[PDB]
Amino acid sequence: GSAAIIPPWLNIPENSRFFVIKSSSLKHVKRSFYNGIWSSTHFGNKRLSEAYKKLNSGAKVFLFFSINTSGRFCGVAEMVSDLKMDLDTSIWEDEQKYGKAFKVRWVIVRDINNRSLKRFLIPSNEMKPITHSRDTQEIPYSIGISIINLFKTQDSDIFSFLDE
């Protein structure tokens, strides 16, 4: 039936960090999924890279992928490398808009309806809902964990961008 991906185990330890990713296209999300990379802007990449660098022990960086205007929140990926000089950034339309790529692994692939994400208010984006976040907006650990738990729910209506 469903093509959605929800792993049986996912542990996210203390000092892990959560950011929103806003993509211009469903195209680029899919390509991220099949190639296992992502590129933000030079400035977004700098924010993400500085966070990744300072990780200690088994702390992780997770990315909530969202598509602008549709507001589709379509899955979660872990950042699993820093910025690389030699990954294939040619998969991006208008490549020079974005910087160096870094590796990602898509841990969860399924949609969450905007309706049920409006509840989450983000203290450092003037307390707006998470659906108003711009690209690389940081999300406090505790809120991020609660959003992962919604993503992990084996809902009977579950849909993904792999269904299609």
Q: Tell me if 114 is assigned to a ligand binding site.
A: no
Amino acid, res. 50: E
Q: Tell me if 22 is assigned to a ligand binding site.
A: yes
Q: Tell me if 24 is assigned to a ligand binding site.
A: yes
Q: Tell me if 103 is assigned to a ligand binding site.
A: no
Q: Tell me if 23 is assigned to a ligand binding site.
A: yes
Coil, strand, or helix at residue 117?
helix
Please state, in angstroms and rounded to a whole number, the distance separating the CA atoms of residues 103 and 105.
7
83, 99 Cβ separation under 8 angstroms: yes
Please state, in angstroms and rounded to a whole number, the distance separating the CA atoms of residues 110 and 108.
6
Q: Which residue's structure tokens are 């990744």?
A: 52
Q: Which two tokens stand for residue 1?
A: 């039936």
Known binding residues for RNA are 22-24, 68, 92
Known binding residues are 22-24, 68, 92
